Design a protein around this ligand. Structure first.
Ligand SMILES: Nc1ncnc2c1ncn2[C@@H]1O[C@H](COP(=O)(O)O)[C@@H](O)[C@H]1O
Ligand SMILES: Nc1ncnc2c1ncn2[C@@H]1O[C@H](COP(=O)(O)O)[C@@H](O)[C@H]1O
Ligand SMILES: O=CNCC(=O)N[C@@H]1O[C@H](COP(=O)(O)O)[C@@H](O)[C@H]1O
Ligand SMILES: O=CNCC(=O)N[C@@H]1O[C@H](COP(=O)(O)O)[C@@H](O)[C@H]1O
Lengths: 334, 334
C-alpha cells in the first residue's frame, strides 16, 4: 500500500481518541498538588515527579508488533533489548539517568521456550542500559492476545536545575543525529504488511533475510548521552520513535533545517515499495535513532563524544521557520 | 471448565516459564549495587528501591480478561477503576503511600467512544486512591490484541524503617479480612468461560445481571490501610489477587487458621456450576479483598478503623504450625 494508516495504525485517529484520557489525566494532577510526587505536564518523553531535591522521571513503552516476527522464527532473544531500549532512551530525553524497570508480559500461553529467550535479551539490555529489572507482571490471556506482547515501565532520576526539556533550544543551535541500528521498534505494522506477503520472511536483501532486518534490536543510547550531558551544554534530546522526525516538535517551537543520511537497508526496500518519502520520515527513524541539540560552538566536541560510541552525523541547525522541519536534501517539509 | 487451568490459565506452568525471567532479573540487581535505586528482592507485591531516606515502591498490574466482558456488553467506564485499584492496592502491601501511575493501553483500534468511557473510570479510581495519572502509552495493534487491554505501573513511597513485608508476622498474630466489592479482577477467565455460554450476560441472578456481577469494579483500599498503618502496629498486608488465599504464603512461612465468609453472589453461582471449593479459594477472592495481620493487642482497634470504611471481619490467627492455610469452616486446607 502506501501509508501507516492504511496498514492499520492511524496516528491522527489515535490522538483524537486519546484527548479524553489526557484531559482526565491532567485533572488528576491536583491530587498531588504541593505534595511529594507532584507531576509536570503530559506530552514529553517522560513524566517528571517532584521529590524535592530531584525529579523522578517515569515512562512506559511497548515493543509493538515486532514480536510477530520474533515468534515466526522462534527468536525472542532480543525482544527484551527492544523493550528496555525504548523505555531508557525516553528517560534520557528529560536528562535523567535510568535506574530501574518493570516489565509487563501479556502472552497467549506460558511458553517456557519463549520465556527463556525473552530472558536472554532482558539481561543484555539491562546491562548495557545500567538498569535493574526489579519486577513485573505476567498475564496469560489467549482470548485477548495473539502472541507475546512485551512492554515495560522505567524510572530515572534528574537533579533539579538539570532537566533538559528543549526550552533552551535557540535558533542557530546545531542538530546532531546518532545512527540507529536499523528499524528499531517503530513502523513495524507498515513494514510487516508491506513486505512480508510480497517477499516472504526468507527474502534475502543485502545478505540478510527479511526477518533479520525486521528483528534487529533497538539501539541503547544511555552511555553516549549520559557522557554527553556531563561534558557539554545540551539544549535538547529526542529519541526517534513513533512520529519519526515529528518528535523534534515536542522540544521547541523553532524550526529545523536538516540533511538526513542516505536511505539504506530496510528503509530503502520500504521506499522502493511505494511509501511516500514524507510519510517515511514521519514513521521510520530513517537511519537516525536519536537527535541532540547543542550550542553551535559545542558541535565538534559533542560529535567527538558521541562518535566514540556510534556513528554520528551533523544534521543541521535550528531556524526561525517556526514549526517546520525541512529535510533539505530530500525536498521534504514536515 | 471446572478448573482455572482447564479454562486456559495454568498457574503452575506460568511459574515454571517465569523461572528464567526471574533469575535474569535478579542477576541485574548488581547493576545498581551501592547506587541510587538499589533494589530489594523480587517476589513481593512491589519492588523496593533505595533512595536514601526512603524507598520507592514500584508495581505493575493489568486488568485481565475482565475487559472482554466490558467489550461484549459495551460498558468500559469502570475498567479504569480496576486498573488503578490493582496497582495501588499492591503498593499498600509494602506499607507504601501511592503517588503516581502511568497506564498502558493496547487496543485493537482507536475507538473514541471506548476511550471516553475508559477515561471516566480512570478519574474515579485516581481520586479515590489519591494518585495522579502522569503519562502512559497507547498501542494500536489489531494483529496482536483482540480487545482493549488496560494495564499500568504505579509508584509509592515508604520511609526507611516503615516497610511492611510480612517478616514481622509471628504465630499468634490476628488475621483480619476486608470485604471485596465482588469478583475484582482475578479468575475472570474461568467465570467468563463457565457462565456466559450457559446463561448469557443478561441472566439475572440474585437481583443483578451477570454482567453486573462480572464488571463490578475492584475495591480500592488506600484510605483504610493508610489510616490503619498510621494508627496501630501492622505486621503484614496482602491484596487478594491471583491465587486467592495463596497470596498469604508470600508474606510468611507460618501457617494460618481462618474462617471465611459465607459463599454469596457470583461466587455461589460459580460454585453451583461445578467448581470445587478448594479450587475456588485459590482462584477467587471469595468475599475478602484484602487481608491484614496485626498483633492481637491491636486487633480491636484495627477492626474499628477498618469497619469505618468497609465491612471487615476477624478471620483467624497465624499458627506456629508452618505452611498450611486451614479454612476451618469449609474443611479446606490449602
Ligand atoms: N494511554 C495514555 N494515558 C496517558 N497518557 C498517555 C497515554 N498515551 C500517551 N500518553 C502521553 O502522551 C504523550 C505522547 O505519547 P507518545 O505518543 O507515546 O510519545 C506522552 O507524554 C505520554 O505519556
Ligand atoms: N514478567 C515478569 N517479570 C519480572 N518479574 C515478574 C514478572 N511477572 C511476575 N513477576 C514478579 O513475580 C512476583 C509475583 O507476581 P504475581 O504472580 O503477579 O503476584 C512479583 O514480585 C512480580 O514482580
Ligand atoms: O494481578 C495483577 N493483574 C491481574 C493479572 O495478573 N491477571 C493475569 O491475567 C491472566 C488472566 O486473568 P483473568 O482474566 O482470568 O482474571 C492470568 O495470567 C492472570 O494472572
Ligand atoms: O513508543 C513506545 N512503544 C512503541 C509503540 O508505541 N508502539 C505502538 O504500537 C502501534 C504499532 O506499532 P508498530 O508495531 O507498527 O511498530 C502503534 O500504535 C504504536 O504507537
Amino acid at each position: 500500500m502506501l501509508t501507516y494508516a492504511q496498514a492499520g495504525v492511524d496516528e491522527e485517529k489515535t490522538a483524537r481518541a486519546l484527548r479524553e484520557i489526557i484531559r482526565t489525566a491532567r485533572e488528576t494532577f491536583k491530587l498531588r498538588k504541593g505534595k511529594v510526587g507532584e507531576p509536570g505536564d503530559i506530552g514529553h518523553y517522560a513524566a517528571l515527579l517532584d521529590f524535592g531535591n530531584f525529579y523522578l522521571a517515569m515512562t512506559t513503552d511497548g515493543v509493538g508488533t515486532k514480536v510477530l516476527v520474533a515468534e515466526a522464527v522462534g527468536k525472542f532473544d532480543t525482544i527484551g533489548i527492544d523493550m528496555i531500549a525504548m523505555n531508557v532512551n525516553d528517560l534520557l530525553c528529560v536528562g535523567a539517568e535510568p535506574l530501574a524497570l518493570v516489565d509487563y508480559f501479556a502472552v497467549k500461553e506460558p511458553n517456557e521456550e519463549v520465556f527463556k529467550q525473552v530472558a536472554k535479551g532482558l539481561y543484555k539490555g539491562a546491562e548495557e542500559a545500567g538498569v535493574a529489572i526489579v519486577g513485573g507482571e505476567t498475564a496469560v490471556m489467549p482470548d485477548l492476545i495473539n502472541g507475546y506482547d512485551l512492554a515495560g515501565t522505567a524510572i530515572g532520576i534528574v537533579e533539579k536545575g538539570k532537566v533538559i526539556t528543549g526550552e533552551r533550544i535557540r535558533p542557530g543551535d546545531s542538530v546532531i543525529g546518532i545512527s540507529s541500528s536499523g528499524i528499531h521498534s517503530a513502523g513495524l505494522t507498515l513494514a510487516r504488511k508491506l513486505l512480508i506477503p510480497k517477499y516472504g520472511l526468507d527474502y534475502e536483501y543485502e545478505g540478510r533475510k527479511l526477518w533479520e532486518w525486521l528483528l534487529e534490536p533497538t539501539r541503547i543510547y544511555v552511555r553516549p548521552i549520559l557522557e554527553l550531558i556531563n561534558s557539554v551544554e545540551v539544549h535538547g534530546l529526542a529519541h526517534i520513535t513513533g512520529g519519526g522526525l515529528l518528535n523534534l516538535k515536542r522540544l521547541t517551537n523553532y524550526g529545523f533545517e536538516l540533511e538526513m543520511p542516505p536511505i539504506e537497508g530496510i528503509f530503502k526496500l520500504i521506499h522502493e515499495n511505494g511509501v511516500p518519502l514524507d510519510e517515511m520520515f514521519r514513521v521510520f527513524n530513517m537511519g537516525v535513532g536519536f537527535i541532540v541539540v547543542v550550542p553551535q560552538e559545542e558541535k565538534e566536541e559533542a560529535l567527538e563524544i558521541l562518535s566514540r560510541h556510534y556513528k554520528s552525523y551533523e544534521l543541521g541547525n535550528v531556524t526561525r521557520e517556526l514549526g517546520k522541519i525541512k529535510v533539505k536534501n530530500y525536498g521534504i517539509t514536515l
